[PDB]
Symmetry: D2
Subunit: 251 residues, 4 copies
C-alpha cells in the first residue's frame, strides 16, 4: 500500500492501545517508527512485536520531560533520518470533577497532557520545517476536547488546550510556508486491555446515551485516521479536528 | 490498494471537479461507481475517461428530481449489485447576500443543495440499511457549513442544513443498528476548471486572510477523505464533520 | 428599567409560549410590539393580555407567507413608527427521522422554519438598515441547530440552516455599516402549554442524559436573552449563537 | 434597575479595563463587589472611583496564588456576606507563536490564565454551592478559545482549556443540584488603555478581515453580558459560550 512511503514518525505513548495500533499501521504503510513509553521492558517488547529495528525502535521517555524531547528527536534521526511525522499520543487521566481535583493531580495531568504536547509540537515545528518532508504533527485529543465530562475536569482542560493550541501552530506553520501541518484527532471510547481490566466499563461506555452505535471502537479506528493525516493525501488539511466517536458528540 | 473492495457507490455531480476526482479514486480503490450529472454528453465522456462500464457508468439526473432518485438506485443495482455508498456531491451556488437573494434563486439553490441531499440520504438509508454492506453516506458540505460568507446567503443556509440533518440521520442509523454511517465533508477552496475560467478567482481565494496555506486545494484533496469515509477504515466515524480547507476555518 | 427605550419590535409566533414571553418582557422594557400568529381569537386576546394598543398589537400572519411580510412591516410602521427589532420565532416540528420524513412534511416545515426566517431576515435588513435605529434581528434556532436528534430530521435541517444563514446576514450587515445586527438564540427544552399537551414529554426532556439540570426551562429564560440582544447593550454582538439549554449541549 | 439585587461578586483583575467595567455595572445593578488586582495604588483608587466601601472594596491578589484564593473568599464574605458570583477575568498575554514560546513564558501565562481560573472555579463551587444564592461562575475566555492566532500559542492553549474545563464544572454542578452555573464569555477585541498603549493594535484589530464591524468593542460590551450571566435572568444557562466579538468568529 506504501501510503507513508519514506515517512519517519515519532509516536509518544506508542507501546500500548491507540499508540501501538498507530505504530503498527504506520510500519505496514512503509513509515519508519520510533515509539516512546515510560518502561523499557514494555517498550522494547512492543517494538519487536511490530517489526525489526530497520522498521521500528523504542525510546524511553516521559512526554513531560522537556530535555528528553531533544534526545528523542536525535535518536530517531540517527536511526531513520530526518523526522517527518509526530503523533503526540502520550496522555494520563484523573477521575475527578474540577471541584474534587487536588492541585498535585492538576499539575501532574497538565505536565503530560498539555506541557508534553506543547514541547513536542514546538520542537517538531523547529526540527521538521523547511525540509520538503511533507511534515505532519497529529495531536491526540478525545471527545473531551469538545464536550465536558463532570468527572474529568483536568482532562477536559488539557484536551480543550491542545485543541486550540494546535490551531495556532497550524496557522503559524501555514503562514510561514514551513511545510508542517498540525491537526487534532478526537477518539470517542476505544476498547483496550486497560478498559477490559475494569469490570462493566465497556458496557457503560456502550449505552446509547453515551455511544449511539451501542458499542465502543478499537485502536485501529484511530490508527486509520492517523495514516490519512500523516500521509500526503491530507496535504490541504491543517488546523482541523477529526472526530471518530461512534456518534458520541453528534447528540 | 483495494481500500473499497466490493463497494458500490453513487456519486451525484460526479462528472466534474470534486465529484469526478472522488469517482476516479473510488474506481482506483476497487469500487464500482455510478456518476450522475445533468448532461448526457459530459457524463458518458466522463465515465469512459475513468474506466470501462464494468467499473463505472453514468446516469443522467438532477439531484432535485425526487422520482429520478428511485430510477438512479435501480440502475446502479442493475449494473453493479446493491448500493453500499452514496456521495451527495451535486450542488449549485448563488452569489448573493441574504438581502439581495430573489425568492426564485433561494428555491432553486435549496432544491439541489438541500432537498436533493434529503432525497438521497432518505432513499440511501431505506435501500442500504440492514444488508451488511458497511454502508456509508457522505454528504458534501463546505467551509460555508461552519462560517458565514456575506455574499453566499442561500448557500450558507443549505450547508448549515446538510451539516445538522446529517447528524440526525447518523444518530437514527446508529440507534437502529442499520449499518449505515452518515458524515459530512467540508472543502475549503478547490482549484477546478470552473475556478480557472474566472480571472483572479484563485488569486483572491489564495490570500492569507482567506486560506492561510496561501494556495487553494485540488479535487484529489477531497477524493482522499471520501475514500477513508466510504471504506470500512472509518467504521466508528458517524455524525462527524471532516474539514479540508488549508486553515480557512482555523482563524 | 426601560432597556428597550424607543424600540419597535415584530415578534413572529408572538401569541403563545416563548414568543409571548419575549413580547411581555419587550413591553415591560419600553418596546412597542407587533406579535404575529395564525389565529385572530388567540392573537387579539394575547395582545390585550400584555398591554394597551399603544404598547402592543396583533397582526394575523403565517411566517411562510412572503406577501404577508410586506403588509406586516407596513402595519407595524403605521402603528408604532419604523421597525428597529425583528424576532423570527415562529416555528413548527415534525416528529420523524430523516428516513421516515414524507416530502410534504419536509416542505411544510422548511416553509415556516427556513423560508419564513429568510423572508423576515431579508425584508428586515432592507427596511431597518441605515436609519440609526440600533437594529437587531434575533433568529430563533434551537439546540437542534447544534446537535442531531434522530426523530427531528427536517427540524435539524431548518435549525442548522438558520444558524449559518444568520452568520451570512450578520457579516454583510457589519461589512456594509447597515446598523443591523443578526444573532441566533438556541433554546434547550422549554415548558409551554404545547409541551404540557404531550404526555411524558417534559419528563423525557428532564432526564439528566438530556438536560443535566434535571428540569426544562420556562419562556422567560428565552425572553431575557432576547431583551439583551434587542437592546443596545449587545451593540458589539453579531453573527453569534446564544445557547440557553440547562447544559444539554455541554455534554 | 437592581438586576443583581443581593448578589456578592468577586471579580479578578477588576481594577482595570474589562474587569473594572464589570465591577462598575455590577455595583450599578445592586451587587456588592470585591475587585482584585496586583497593585494596591491602582486597586484602592479603582474601588473608590466606583463607589463606597459598603458597595465595593479591593483585595490585592495574583490569581495564580492558590493560598491567596482562600483569603480572598474569606475577606469578601467578612465585608459583604456569602459570595454568590465569581468572575475569573484576570489574564495575561504572550505575543509568541507556539514555535517561539519559551518554557518560562508558557508556565507564567498558564499559571494566571489556566491555574488561576481552575483555583477560582474549584474554590467557588465549594464555597457557593447549596446556599440558595443563585450562584454563577463567569470564566473569561476569548475568541482565542474558538480560533487560533499564529502569534498567541500559549494564550490559545489557556483559552481552549478554560472553555472546556468550564463545561466540565457546569455539568458536575448541574447534575449534583449545587445551585452553581458555570459559563464562559468570549470577548473579541476590546478597547482599553492597555490596547491604546500598543501603537497600531486597535487599527490592525479593526481591519474587516479581523473584525467585520470595522471597529473594536468597549469594556461595557463585556460588562452587560456579565450582568445577564450573574443575574437570575440566566438561571437556565450553564455550560454555554457567550461570544461578543463584532463578527470575528462568524467568518
Ligand atoms: Mg492498553
Ligand atoms: Mg512503556
Ligand atoms: Mg527544546
Ligand atoms: Mg504543509
Ligand atoms: Mg470543473
Ligand atoms: Mg453532466
Ligand atoms: Mg423515495
Ligand atoms: Mg455502520
Ligand atoms: Mg395565534
Ligand atoms: Mg418516502
Ligand atoms: Mg444594531
Ligand atoms: Mg440543577
Ligand atoms: Mg452531546
Ligand atoms: Mg491592580
Ligand atoms: Mg525553545
Ligand atoms: Mg445558579
Ligand atoms: Mg458596522
Ligand atoms: Mg474565521
Amino acid at each position: 500500500s506504501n501510503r507513508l512511503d519514506g515517512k519517519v514518525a515519532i509516536i509518544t505513548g506508542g507501546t500500548l492501545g491507540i499508540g501501538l495500533a498507530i505504530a503498527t499501521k504506520f510500519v505496514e504503510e512503509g513509515a519508519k517508527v520510533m515509539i516512546t513509553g515510560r518502561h523499557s521492558d514494555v517498550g522494547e517488547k512492543a517494538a519487536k512485536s511490530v517489526g525489526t529495528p530497520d522498521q521500528i525502535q523504542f525510546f524511553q521517555h516521559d512526554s513531560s520531560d522537556e530535555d528528553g524531547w531533544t534526545k528523542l528527536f536525535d535518536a530517531t534521526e540517527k536511526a531513520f533520518g530526518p523526522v517527518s511525522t509526530l503523533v503526540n499520543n502520550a496522555g494520563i487521566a484523573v477521575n475527578k470533577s474540577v471541584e474534587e481535583t487536588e492541585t498535585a493531580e492538576w499539575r501532574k495531568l497538565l505536565a503530560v497532557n498539555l506541557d508534553g504536547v506543547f514541547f513536542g509540537t514546538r520542537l517538531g515545528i523547529q526540527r521538521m520545517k523547511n525540509k520538503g518532508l511533507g511534515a505532519s504533527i497529529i495531536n491526540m485529543s478525545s471527545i473531551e476536547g469538545f464536550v465536558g465530562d463532570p468527572s474529568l475536569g483536568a482532562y477536559n482542560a488539557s484536551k480543550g488546550a491542545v485543541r486550540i493550541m494546535s490551531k495556532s501552530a497550524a496557522l503559524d506553520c501555514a503562514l510561514k510556508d514551513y511545510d508542517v501541518r498540525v491537526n487534532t484527532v478526537h477518539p470517542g471510547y476505544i476498547k483496550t486491555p486497560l478498559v477490559d481490566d475494569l469490570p462493566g466499563a465497556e458496557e457503560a461506555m456502550s449505552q446509547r446515551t453515551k455511544t449511539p452505535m451501542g458499542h465502543i471502537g478499537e485502536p485501529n479506528d484511530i490508527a486509520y485516521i492517523c495514516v490519512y493525516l500523516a500521509s500526503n493525501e491530507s496535504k490541504f488539511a491543517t488546523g482541523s479536528e477529526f472526530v471518530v466517536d461512534g456518534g458520541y458528540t453528534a447528540q
